[PDB]
Design a protein around this ligand. Structure first.
Ligand code: SF4
Lengths: 95, 160, 427, 353, 166, 180, 117
């Protein structure tokens, strides 16, 4: 149960991260931590329910990685000719 | 139990604290690896061995490194680059953070389950048949997903 | 089966397309889709599982719609690139996958599968289309984390990793909400919507068509396999229809407007969920699709990029047929009789009334009047504003297609009781 | 493991501590010998004074190394500068205690190895990534973009080859059914050494083991006569030694791994003498590298990349897949034995020149 | 901090250092090939601990000023000298360095010690390779603390720790 | 970046400063900057005897000294009108060509070392030494060779020189092949 | 199976390494002269700085990195397969074969296109 409290804390923490930082990459960083909070949770439940949450975790992991890549690709492509890093700064769309 | 166990969670959480404070990108990132270190240890402690190794392999090995290459690429070791369009939002962030945990905590107070039906589960031995046969759908999905990702990723950089 | 076609074709095509010139690849892509679609038709009325992957009637219906949309959109653009087809292909497949399983993790994965290439498709390489993209991605991953947290709590609440488990209350109660979170963003339900107009502004029309159709479909579709508190739903809906219409007063641009519109529609769709009757919801979305499809098609022949409302006006001059089509569209979106939208609306409402939710339902009715403002605001404008500015005459492809559609609209307007009897059998 | 009983923690520690400094001394005398051994080849004679046979020189070298403040620049990253070597050296040291040296427990009643794992390879593989962390970090730490850019080349490249090692390590794990080292050895104890069974995987593994900074990749770089290497260049005293050190430990770790894999660790069909056979393999591979070191050159990295990417990794998994097929299909493995040996002969003969 | 407690220790450390000395040669002219000679083949720096050569002079400390030097090259060289850490020696290799021979231009620099300390002169442009060997033996034994001058004057084992970097 | 690849860096046998406009992996252009070894020989030597000037020639290129040497010798000899013993020209050419070989040794020596393995250098050097040794004998010096006293050399070869010269001519073909 | 013991042993190994690490550094920090630079703090490209242009650098590095991730994941899966394999029979093998072929498309895309961009 302790562990499950811990997981929730890390989720919360990440949020505080995401919300404070206006620098996008650091946001993105935070996100990742939350995701892992999840995987911990899975492990806790695996102790109840029999280890399907391991396999789960693995799948999840892979997905996270995938979205990382793509997100960074975007991040790249955005500041491949632009020098900002915090991105509400860019607000061309707005209305 | 709770002696060592207690400590490791303190530390883990601590690592978490660091990364959301740090405006030294590098310092941040570094902490997060150390995070995963603990987490991996804890995985093993909760008898998830394979998962332990993979945590390391992927995240630390690949993921953060890629991240790092970018931030180096973009020459920012710090998010301290401007000053915020809102600063009022900081305590408000902190407010919400408490709330989101509170609800989860409440929800989780009102139960306990088993935690006990196997041991030595981290072994790929018994995990293979499930994956191979049942999670196989997912597997194939995943495999394609990656491929698509690749193509996407490419398309991000140069057109076609 | 159809899936079979998708995976293979995609894979093969990937490399193959180098041999071909992009037009030959466009040709290719068109074929593939049509075959996959075909395979649905020929199997319509039998369910086929292989594992948890289980194509049912419901799935089938929604992917009819989706595939259609993607064909059209590719139809519309020849000034693009083959990658911008490929990715669509991919995405579609991803959504097929979403519908035909009740295994949560796959479903999650499916959301990602559809969202990723969409981001890439989000640019005609313009600066705007990167901002738009970015936001959407960023928000998507956030919602992901929630959706993931939900799933974990399902494994928490039961050893099940597939829908269908009843649990107890609170944890399970909680857990389910977070699934609504994911889905919410994906259907762009309020209060998970902010971005969608803005993103539309940033993104070029054809893309937007596709996004505004398929993803919403998929979302509602999948949402249907999940079950939920009527109270949550009621909230969401309210915010969606209200904010939608209110911001629509503020508007001066097509792209954002239509987003808001499809949020109101999302509110309406979410009514159906009170019973989860996919005969009703099936019908609705089908009909909804047509109209929505129509609207962007027209808009593309104007510009396949952002253009404010005013620019549009005088269309009957430009072509009479087009003027009528677009007109019909506005009415359809109003959901008037003898257009299928009225019935669609009604049906949803019937599921609501069973659910016995009054206040909400009433409010819904109110705001459904509101919407008419902008529909006539456009629809009459068609005939007026005799100034003419950039117009693109397009192919016979689209013209015929569109006019078929506007008639088809009014056709189910008169015979909605045609398909619906033998709709949504679950297999 | 569970299949073999464990030592109490104190005794582990003792062994650990020993082996650590053991590997210090290992490198020490190796450099000395390599230097000299090159000389002989290279129509020159090595150290023979301050020895005699320069035997006291490593000590001397070390003493020299100290008493010099390892320079810190303005525009430095304080923590990282110090940290970056530490880490790498830590991760170089680690993963060798794992390995046994003789039959179980049979080191004077105590375990040859320091630790050991059922899940062997993974650990190895895992630790290998973390040195590379060090690589680029040092670059960054220094704040030299010259160094940095090099480190990116480096790290990237390293990491590509890192992947090929994985695909190699799949193969024997099939055969034994496990990545438990003991078991792998023991398999060979009955069935035979792994160099028999998968000659083209042996090849690619070798050529992957190059990638542990082992030269002949060798646009590693160094600063001498090239676009400078990262890590070093902006360091000085002890820290420079550390980099170098690490590189050697990789080298030495590798010098063990290739025997472990293809021939097994210690072990001979002709006689069992415990300790001897291990050192002898080690020794060999060492010398073999030195032949490489001399008689082989520098690529141009472009070439290398093309090579790994275009040839090695797809081809490695291609071969693997074959092997996976055999093992999956549960037939006599004989046909593969037959094929491997022949395929090597073919693949050499096809390009005999 | 350089090696000392009692008598024993410092002499020890100095011996260690001296016998391990690491040449950073700094070619600039005709010298270089004779230096390459001084390494190669039937020449041996092997047992002389000076079989060690490192591009970073941040990672070496014995400077062998080997070549010919221009006004235009002088400040450059100045920085090069500067870019050495704390212990560090100047061999002035051959005549060209040491004073600069026949060239007596208004266009040149002469007599390198102007801009650096010198510990060892070794003239000859070139000298015999072996003289440099002899030189390093010199510099070795200089650092061994036996160092003297022919005017009967003591020469400390450092004399270019008498031109300092901070 | 615009890298300013300076003297001796990285460990370049030569020196000079190069402003390398680097496009990214493909270089744009190099703006060369030198003057880092200029002297002004030509002035000083105009303040010298012609005979004295003969010492300045080996300080130009030293890899092949003799070409300078020859070129100058001849030029002068010609200029005020002079002849040369047959034996002289023969030897002078021998020496010249030997110096040519030397030059090549260094050219290739550096090539081999520089990129690729360092090693082949050492053998070429072994041979180079031989050559140099040959030179030591005859000119009393390792290099910067002086023998030419204009109108020939100073005096005829050692006789012992002739055997030793043979030796190296035996080895060299055999030796060459493996380097090639 | 595994002894919990050896994980203990793991921790052991690491703690040792860190001490010896720290020892070397403590030597390093305290020893040597305390004489600073002030212009040796400027880079070694010949006393030249690499500064001369500041620009954006190859996507090459991204490409490679990204590649590696995907394939590292690939590998991940093939390890379980490695463990349990013949027991999974032909249906095992076929699934994997399919999967593998998918990732091979990534490679192949990049072979005709070329990693240099
Ligand atoms: S001092 Fe002698 S060896 Fe040196 S540059 Fe002059 S000639 Fe060459």
């Amino acid at each position: 149960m302790s562990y499950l409290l811990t997981s929730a804390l890390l989720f919360a923490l990440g949020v505080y991260g995401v919300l404070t930082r206006r620098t996008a990459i650091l946001v993105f960083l935070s996100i990742e931590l939350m995701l892992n909070a999840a995987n911990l949770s899975l492990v806790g439940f695996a102790r109840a329910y029999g280890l399907d949450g391991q396999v789960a975790a693995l799948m999840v992991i892979a997905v996270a990685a995938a979205e990382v890549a793509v997100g960074l690709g975007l991040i790249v492509a955005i500041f491949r000719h632009r020098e900002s890093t915090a991105v509400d700064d860019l607000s061309e769309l707005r209305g | 139990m709770s002696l060592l166990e207690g400590l490791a969670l303190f530390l883990l959480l601590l690592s978490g604290v660091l990364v959301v404070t740090l405006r030294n990108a590098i310092h941040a990132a570094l902490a997060l690896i150390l995070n995963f270190l603990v987490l991996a240890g804890v995985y093993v402690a909760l008898d998830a061995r394979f998962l332990g190794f993979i945590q390391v392999i992927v995240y630390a090995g690949a993921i953060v490194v890629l991240f790092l290459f970018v931030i180096m690429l973009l020459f920012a070791a710090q998010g301290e680059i401007g000053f915020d369009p809102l600063v009022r939002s900081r305590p408000l962030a902190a407010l919400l953070a408490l709330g989101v945990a509170g609800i989860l905590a409440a929800g989780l107070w009102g139960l306990d389950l088993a935690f006990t039906q196997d041991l030595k589960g981290g072994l790929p031995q018994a995990l293979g048949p499930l994956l191979y046969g049942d999670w196989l759908f997912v597997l194939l999905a995943v495999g394609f997903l990656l491929m698509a990702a690749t193509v996407v990723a490419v398309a991000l950089v140069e057109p076609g | 089966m159809t899936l079979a076609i998708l995976a293979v074709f995609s894979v093969a095509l990937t490399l193959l397309g180098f041999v071909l010139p992009p037009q030959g690849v466009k040709r290719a892509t068109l074929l593939g889709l049509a075959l996959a679609l075909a395979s649905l038709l020929l199997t319509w009325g039998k369910p086929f599982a292989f594992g948890p992957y289980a194509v049912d009637g419901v799935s089938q219906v929604f992917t009819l719609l989706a595939l259609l949309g993607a064909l059209w959109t590719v139809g519309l653009v020849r000034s693009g690139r083959f990658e911008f087809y490929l990715l669509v292909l991919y995405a579609a497949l991803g959504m097929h996958l979403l519908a035909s399983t009740r295994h949560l993790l796959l479903m999650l994965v499916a959301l990602e599968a559809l969202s990723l290439p969409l981001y890439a498709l989000a640019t005609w390489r313009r600066g705007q289309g990167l901002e738009a993209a970015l936001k959407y991605f960023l928000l998507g991953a956030l919602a992901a984390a929630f959706f993931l947290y939900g799933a974990a709590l399902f494994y928490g609440a039961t050893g099940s990793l597939v829908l269908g488990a009843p649990g107890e209350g609170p944890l399970y109660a909680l857990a389910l909400g977070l699934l609504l979170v994911g889905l919410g963003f994906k259907a762009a339900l309020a209060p998970f919507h902010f971005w969608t107009p803005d993103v539309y502004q940033g993104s070029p029309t054809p893309v937007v068509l596709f996004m505004a159709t398929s993803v919403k479909a998929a979302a509602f579709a999948a949402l249907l396999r999940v079950a939920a508190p009527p109270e949550a739903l009621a909230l969401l809906v309210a915010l969606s229809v209200v904010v939608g219409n209110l911001a629509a007063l503020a508007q001066k641009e097509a792209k954002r407007l239509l987003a808001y519109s499809s949020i109101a529609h999302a509110g309406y769709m979410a009514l159906a969920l009170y019973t989860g009757n996919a005969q009703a919801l099936g019908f609705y979305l089908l009909t909804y699709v047509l109209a929505t499809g129509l609207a962007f098609a027209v808009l593309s022949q104007i510009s396949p990029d952002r253009v404010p409302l005013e620019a549009l006006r005088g269309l009957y001059r430009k072509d009479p047929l087009l003027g009528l089509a677009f007109l019909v569209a506005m009415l359809s979106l109003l959901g008037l009789p003898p257009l299928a939208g009225f019935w669609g609306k009604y049906l949803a409402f019937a599921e609501a009334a069973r659910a016995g939710a009054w206040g909400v339902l009433v409010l819904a009715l109110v705001t459904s009047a509101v919407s008419a403002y902008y529909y006539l605001g456009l629809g009459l404008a068609v005939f007026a504003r005799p100034e003419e500015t950039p117009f693109r005459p397009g192919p016979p492809w689209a013209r015929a297609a569109v006019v078929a559609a506007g008639v088809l609209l009014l056709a189910l307007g008169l015979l909605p009781g045609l398909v619906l009897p033998a709709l949504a059998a679950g297999g | 493991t569970w299949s073999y009983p464990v030592d109490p923690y104190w005794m582990v520690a003792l062994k650990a501590l020993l082996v650590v400094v053991g590997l210090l001394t290992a490198f020490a005398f190796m450099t000395l010998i390599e230097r000299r051994l090159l000389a002989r080849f290279q129509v020159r004679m090595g150290p023979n004074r301050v020895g005699p046979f320069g035997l006291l020189q490593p000590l001397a070298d070390a003493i020299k190394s100290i008493f010099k403040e390892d320079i810190v620049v303005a525009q430095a990253d304080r923590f990282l500068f110090v940290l970056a070597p530490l880490i790498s050296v830590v991760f170089a040291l680690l993963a060798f205690g794992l390995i046994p040296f003789g039959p179980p427990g049979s080191f004077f009643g105590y375990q040859p190895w320091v630790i050991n794992l059922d899940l062997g390879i993974l650990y190895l593989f895992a630790v290998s990534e973390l040195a590379v962390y060090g690589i680029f970090l040092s670059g960054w730490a220094s704040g030299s973009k010259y160094s940095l850019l090099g480190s990116l080349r480096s790290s990237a490249s390293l990491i590509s080859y890192e992947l090929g090692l994985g695909l190699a390590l799949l193969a024997p794990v099939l055969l034994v059914g496990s990545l438990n080292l003991n078991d792998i050895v023991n398999w060979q104890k009955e069935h035979g050494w792994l160099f028999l069974y998968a000659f083209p995987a042996f090849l690619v593994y070798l050529i992957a083991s190059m990638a542990e900074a082992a030269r002949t990749p060798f646009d590693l770089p160094e600063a001498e006569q090239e676009l400078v290497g990262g890590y070093h260049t902006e360091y000085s005293s002890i820290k420079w030694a550390l980099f170098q050190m690490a590189e050697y430990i990789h080298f030495i770790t590798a010098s063990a791994l290739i025997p472990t894999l293809f021939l097994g660790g210690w072990t001979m069909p002709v006689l069992e003498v415990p300790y001897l056979w291990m050192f002898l393999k080690i020794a060999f591979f060492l010398f073999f590298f030195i032949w490489i070191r001399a008689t082989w050159f520098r690529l141009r990295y472009d070439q290398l990349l093309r090579f790994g990417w275009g040839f090695l990794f797809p081809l490695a998994l291609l071969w693997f897949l074959v092997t996976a097929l055999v093992v999956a299909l549960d037939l006599p493995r004989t046909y593969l034995l037959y094929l491997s040996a022949l395929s090597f002969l073919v693949l050499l003969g096809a390009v005999l020149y | 901090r350089e090696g000392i407690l009692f008598t024993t220790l410092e002499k020890l450390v100095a011996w260690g250092r001296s016998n391990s000395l690491w040449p950073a040669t700094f070619g600039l002219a005709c010298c270089a090939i004779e230096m390459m000679a001084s390494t190669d083949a039937r020449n041996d720096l092997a047992r002389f601990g000076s079989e060690v050569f490192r591009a970073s002079p941040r990672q070496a400390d014995v400077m062998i000023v080997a070549g010919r030097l221009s006004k235009k090259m002088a400040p450059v060289m100045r920085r090069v000298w500067e870019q050495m850490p704390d212990p560090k020696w100047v061999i002035s290799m051959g005549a060209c360095a040491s004073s600069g021979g026949m060239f007596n231009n208004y266009a040149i620099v002469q007599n390198v010690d102007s801009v650096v300390p010198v510990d060892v002169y070794v003239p000859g442009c070139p000298p015999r390779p072996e003289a440099l060997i002899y030189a390093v033996m010199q510099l070795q034994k200089k650092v061994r603390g036996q160092a003297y001058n022919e005017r009967g004057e003591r020469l400390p084992p450092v004399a270019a720790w008498k031109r300092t970097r901070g | 970046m615009t890298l300013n690849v300076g003297p001796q860096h990285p460990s370049t046998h030569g020196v000079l400063r190069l402003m390398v406009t680097l496009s990214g992996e493909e270089v744009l252009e190099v703006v060369p900057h030198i003057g880092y070894l200029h002297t002004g020989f030509e002035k000083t030597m105009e303040h010298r005897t012609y005979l004295q000037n003969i010492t300045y020639t080996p300080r130009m290129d030293y890899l092949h000294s003799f070409a300078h040497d020859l070129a100058y010798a001849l030029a002068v000899e010609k200029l005020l009108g002079a002849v040369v013993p047959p034996r002289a020209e023969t030897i002078r050419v021998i020496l010249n060509e030997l110096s040519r070989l030397a030059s090549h040794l260094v050219f290739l020596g550096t090539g081999l070392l520089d990129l690729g393995a360092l090693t082949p250098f050492f053998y070429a050097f072994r041979e180079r030494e031989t050559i140099l040794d040959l030179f030591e004998w005859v000119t009393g010096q390792r290099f910067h060779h002086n023998y030419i006293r204009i109108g020939g050399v100073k005096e005829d070869l050692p006789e012992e020189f002739v055997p030793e010269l043979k030796k190296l001519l035996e080895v060299l073909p055999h030796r060459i092949d493996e380097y090639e | 199976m595994a002894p919990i013991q050896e994980y203990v042993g793991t921790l052991i190994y690491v703690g040792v390494a860190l001490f010896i690490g720290v020892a070397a550094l403590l030597v390093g920090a305290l020893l040597g002269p305390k004489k600073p630079g002030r212009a040796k703090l400027m880079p070694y490209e010949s006393g030249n700085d690499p500064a001369g242009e500041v620009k954006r650098f190859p996507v090459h590095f991204y490409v490679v990195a990204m590649l590696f991730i995907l394939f590292d994941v690939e590998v991940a899966f093939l390890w379980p397969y490695a463990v349990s394999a013949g027991g999974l029979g032909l249906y095992g093998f076929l699934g994997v074969l399919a999967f593998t072929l998918l990732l091979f498309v990534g490679f192949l895309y990049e072979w005709w296109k070329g990693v240099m961009r």
